[PDB]
């Protein structure tokens, strides 16, 4: 194997060892459930929807929600596009540039929604008949292994670069088990479960952080908050 | 921190800013109990007698006097603002916020220098003076 594959094996092994070593038993706690509480109110209904449909709904809702966050602050010179790219409509003055400076909360939510939009859009391309199942799986495998280039959340929370490297390492581990024999290089691998797991586990830990950041931001939008000794 | 005069509502803040035509009104927005505010207030207290000919120092609690929080963006623990004849005097400290000193100053002489620079520049009708020292770094090494 090449050197990159060997180091990929060693890094996957390193993180396996670290997970096994740092593992502490889960703590006893009261059974809090979020969606059960949401369903207990009159503001939430239940249905059974196609996954592609609810994915499109989530993409549209995230776009509308960030766009409302932008239009609340009267930033008409800024444009949030549907691939979740903040764009300057015109050449912006320095006073406009400093008023168009968002925190890592907005940009991290924006980039997570960008990744979700890419995934759901690949699925939509599958459902429209433009792209077939094998190329859909290859596209998802490419997406979950190339998040460092399709999106840009590494520049607002750089620790997730750890995930990106992992998603590259797995890409090696799978590829050199996949591209053996009559199978050469080029696209075609669709074993996207490996990187999909990694990004789900990233979201597992980021959900409380992003929720806290966005709660602070939205509370701030609506006038709310939530040599020593001598 | 407690020797300096305190301003107890926004009207008193506005009158203190208006009551001076020949001295720089230096106002510290913050909470007396805050560590950064106490550090800044020690320095302001140690220089308050030395600059009484061209500067007056008042303190303001940003909870007991909340009117200037949205107006002056008083969302830092400590904030030091300079006014000369009912005009906010911006100062280019090199920190990217030319409107206030939103940190605690460790030197008695640096704040005297800043106050004197603000006074001398504002007498000439300048809305922005330039601080004698760049605070874009801390020169630690």
């Amino acid at each position: 194997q090449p050197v990159k594959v060997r180091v990929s094996y060693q890094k996957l092994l390193k993180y396996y060892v670290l997970n096994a070593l740092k593992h502490r038993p889960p703590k006893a706690q009261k059974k809090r459930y979020l969606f059960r509480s949401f369903k207990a109110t009159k503001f939430f209904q239940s249905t059974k929807l196609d996954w592609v449909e609810v994915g499109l709904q989530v993409c549209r809702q995230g776009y509308n929600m960030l766009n409302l966050l932008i239009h609340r602050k009267n930033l008409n010179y800024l444009h949030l596009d549907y691939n979740f790219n903040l764009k300057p409509v015109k050449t912006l003055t320095t006073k406009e540039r400093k008023k168009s400076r968002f925190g890592n909360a907005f940009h991290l939510c924006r980039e997570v929604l960008r990744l979700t939009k890419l995934v759901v859009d690949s699925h939509v391309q599958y459902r429209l008949g433009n792209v077939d199942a094998f190329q859909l799986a290859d596209g998802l495998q490419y997406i979950f292994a190339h998040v460092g280039q399709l999106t840009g959340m590494y520049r607002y929370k750089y620790k997730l670069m750890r995930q990106i490297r992992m998603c590259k390492d797995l890409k090696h581990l799978i590829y050199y088990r996949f591209n053996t024999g009559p199978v050469g290089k080029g696209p075609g691998c669709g074993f996207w479960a490996a990187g999909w797991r990694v990004w789900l586990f990233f979201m597992r830990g980021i959900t409380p952080l992003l929720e806290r950041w966005l709660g602070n931001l939205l509370a701030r939008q609506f006038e709310g908050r939530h040599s020593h000794f001598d | 921190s407690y020797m300096l005069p305190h301003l107890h509502n926004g009207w008193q803040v506005d009158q203190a800013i208006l009551s001076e035509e020949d001295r720089v009104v230096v106002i510290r927005f913050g909470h007396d109990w805050d560590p950064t505010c106490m550090k800044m207030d020690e320095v302001l207290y140690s220089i308050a007698e030395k600059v009484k000919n061209f500067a007056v120092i008042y303190l303001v609690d940003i909870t007991e006097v909340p009117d200037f929080n949205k107006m002056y963006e008083l969302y830092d623990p400590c904030t030091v603002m300079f006014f000369f004849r009912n005009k906010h005097i911006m100062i280019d400290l090199g920190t990217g916020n030319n409107n206030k000193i939103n940190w605690a100053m460790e030197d008695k002489q640096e704040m005297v220098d800043i106050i004197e620079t603000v006074y001398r520049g504002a007498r000439k009708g300048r809305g922005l003076v330039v601080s004698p020292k760049d605070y874009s770094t801390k020169y630690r090494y």
Binding site: N74, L75, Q221 | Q12, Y72
Partner: peptide, 30 residues
């Protein structure tokens, strides 16, 4: 004056004439 009370009808933000900064976006609700 020090110790004096505030007048009833008075906005102490622009009662003398002074405008804000808007240094950035995600600090304060514009």
């Amino acid at each position: 004056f020090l110790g004096m009370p505030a007048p009833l009808g008075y906005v102490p933000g622009l009662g003398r004439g002074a405008t804000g900064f808007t240094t950035r976006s995600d600090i304060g609700p514009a």
